[PDB]
Design a protein around this ligand. Structure first.
Ligand code: 9P5
Ligand code: 9P5
Ligand code: CO
Ligand code: CO
Lengths: 386, 386
């Protein structure tokens, strides 16, 4: 059921901002690893004495990487005279965030009808304010409320190209990389306590619970009216033999934070071929592939959706497959993006639920916890028996 | 003249350590941009709860990238029980260094006969101690003294493979990249006052002044007995029309620090072809090339060393050329390695001074300050006149 209870008009995911020690090196690594183009910048060369911010894009996916300069460069500025292009940025907040959590997502940004109204309604309904609505060049409004941990939900609204003060990148520095990624599908947080986190976020957004279909986790998914903004949240489950991976996350991250970003590809086979070719030459590594038994079991589970050849291509690339009552999902996960075993990326492509494709078609892959465990058990038994 | 006055036995440059916010992303960017292989690691997977350190190598060049984990992971350790593989590492020092200076070189490491004796002799002769000699696994000794700013000169000596506690990298993660770089030629510091810096470093090393052959700088070069360890130092010159680039460095770096690393290539043409192909797909950018007049003037300056075709290849790749009374130098410079206009890299190859090739053959390219200025003037006059 979808009660369509959004308290303000939400459009789509807009961008994700990483807070970095050095934005240049992270942005260049991510560009090559994910096939995203350098599309905009705000830094010393554009008159920003406060922070360096670089924007990568692939289709509608926008990744922003931001790091602070020495405060001495802007020591004479005040907020009314700032050269920062992102008015919510603060040197101390950014250094403290990065010291505490390491490389990770500071902002999950959604485009809304009116960021000032979204902010006001959110705070009136319990949201903890983080940055008030600020109008940039009478053209774009940006505001921020706390989401979980030190992650903020950022609202952006446009009167009518990323943000004023950003310059498009001269095409010599903009190599047109593209491995097929096209948009952010969902963004997932890890929290110590799921219940209060859900009550808080659903309380101030009106987002509803998205319908779902040992593990070490409990999870639930909040969704916007058209279910195109999807925000799963996990908590750890204490009491099992293999330690909860969510708890390990919270320890290494110093608390709640963004766990994974799921990036929709329009051709997950091409995306994974391209990303895997680059894993050991500066790109991203992937989780170890499931055993051949997992792909043997795929035929019985999705043989009506995927041909034998398409299943064998999934096996070549290590792709996981899960299925709903309405759709089928192809997914795969990277190893952690940085030094700490915290944030990682998921590549996903969904088949079915055609109307456009409805949001969340096929679910989030919860069935693969069981299917993976099952397939490993079968594989070890096959090996021992042979 | 070479008085050969080293106060202890110095062998060669050993490694350069960068202090990072996230070592993984910087190391992966540098690996792809410079063609260096991942060769060793010390991190959570090797039992190090304190810092993540990744070693890249190309020939004898060794770049180490280190970042701190959350202090909470090691909060119960003391130095006698540490899981750090680099005993001089400190969470607070590393965060403070990076907050102050951004991404840059913390340690210039030279291999010596006996690091404990080198440390003792250095401090007895004025060196400010930074980390005392520590013997690792009865096999390697490491010690550190202050060089300039927050850069240390690190001594390493081996009884008899990088450092105990580091693990060789499984060849699946070790792609055998190689663009031709083979060793560190020189490492250059920017300081506010050259005189005292030289007196200090030459005071405690016994290094002698290496013989040299508007600019905004004064510079001098300290050298070990066989002139294979080369440490140029620059100070700003105030009073000119175009602001001293050394002063700009000191402002953005919050003081003295390492300005550039010069990496010797065994085939500078191949190195630059490979690095330039990757500039816009995650690698390093280069300074704008000199005008065609510079390469027209090359024929009159080095036509006896380089054929017309070799000169045209220099022009294709933007390579600069300078000449001594003893040798010729091919060189080119990157744009800054990170967000701040501070540290950059030089690629160099030297021809002549055969005995082995003597250190510093051809100088450091000081003649290119004049030759570049001259050639730009000629080019603008050609364009206006045509
Ligand atoms: C074992 S799994 O079936 O690989 C698998 C399936 C689905 C999802 C996610 O996308 C899900 C979704 O977005 C929200 C709901 C819950 C969440 O779990 C993951 Cl995070 C996942 O774990 C991958 C990394 C990890 O590496 C070691 C073990 O797993
Ligand atoms: C104009 S230059 O002739 O490109 C040139 C020639 C030689 C050297 C160095 O290696 C030299 C050496 O190691 C030690 C002695 C002095 C030092 O200067 C440089 Cl740093 C250099 O500037 C490059 C970057 C900068 O970018 C904008 C202007 O220059
Ligand atoms: Co997911
Ligand atoms: Co140089």
């Amino acid at each position: 059921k979808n009660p369509k209870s959004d308290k303000f008009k939400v459009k789509r995911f807009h961008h994700i901002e990483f807070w970095c020690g050095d934005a240049t090196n992270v942005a260049r690594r991510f560009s090559w690893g994910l096939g995203m183009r350098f599309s905009a910048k705000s830094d010393l060369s554009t008159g920003n004495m406060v922070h360096a911010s670089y924007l990568l894009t692939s289709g509608d996916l926008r990744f922003l990487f931001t790091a602070p300069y020495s405060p001495s460069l802007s020591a004479g500025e005040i907020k009314p005279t700032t050269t920062a292009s992102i008015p919510s940025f603060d040197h101390g907040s950014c250094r403290s965030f990065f010291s505490s959590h390491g490389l990770g997502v500071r902002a999950v940004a959604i485009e809304v009808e009116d960021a000032e109204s979204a902010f006001s309604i959110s705070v009136a309904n319990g949201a903890i304010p983080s940055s008030p609505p600020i109008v940039l060049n009478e053209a774009v409004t940006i505001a921020e409320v706390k989401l979980y941990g030190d992650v903020v939900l950022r609202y952006v609204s446009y009167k009518a190209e990323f943000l004023p003060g950003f310059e498009r990148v001269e095409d010599a520095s903009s190599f047109p990389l593209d491995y097929g990624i096209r948009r952010l599908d969902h963004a997932v947080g890890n929290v110590p306590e799921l219940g209060p986190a859900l009550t808080y976020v659903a309380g101030f957004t009106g987002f509803h619970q998205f319908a779902e279909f040992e593990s070490g986790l409990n999870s639930a998914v909040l969704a916007s009216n058209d279910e195109m903004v999807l925000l799963p949240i996990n908590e750890p489950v204490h009491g099992t033999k293999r330690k909860s991976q969510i708890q390990t996350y919270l320890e290494h991250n110093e608390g709640a934070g963004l766990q994974h970003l799921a990036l929709m590809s329009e051709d997950i086979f091409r995306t994974l071929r391209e990303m895997r070719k680059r894993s050991s030459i500066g790109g991203f590594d992937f989780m170890p592939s499931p055993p051949p038994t997992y792909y043997q079991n795929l035929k019985k589970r999705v043989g009506d959706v995927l041909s034998d050849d398409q299943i064998k291509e999934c096996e070549e690339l290590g792709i996981l497959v899960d299925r709903d009552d309405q759709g089928t999902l192809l997914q795969i996960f990277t190893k952690p993006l940085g030094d700490r075993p915290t944030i990682f990326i998921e590549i996903i492509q969904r088949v079915g639920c055609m109307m456009y494709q409805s949001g969340g078609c096929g679910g989030f892959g919860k069935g693969n916890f069981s299917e993976l465990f099952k397939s490993i058990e079968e594989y070890e038994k096959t090996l021992e028996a042979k």
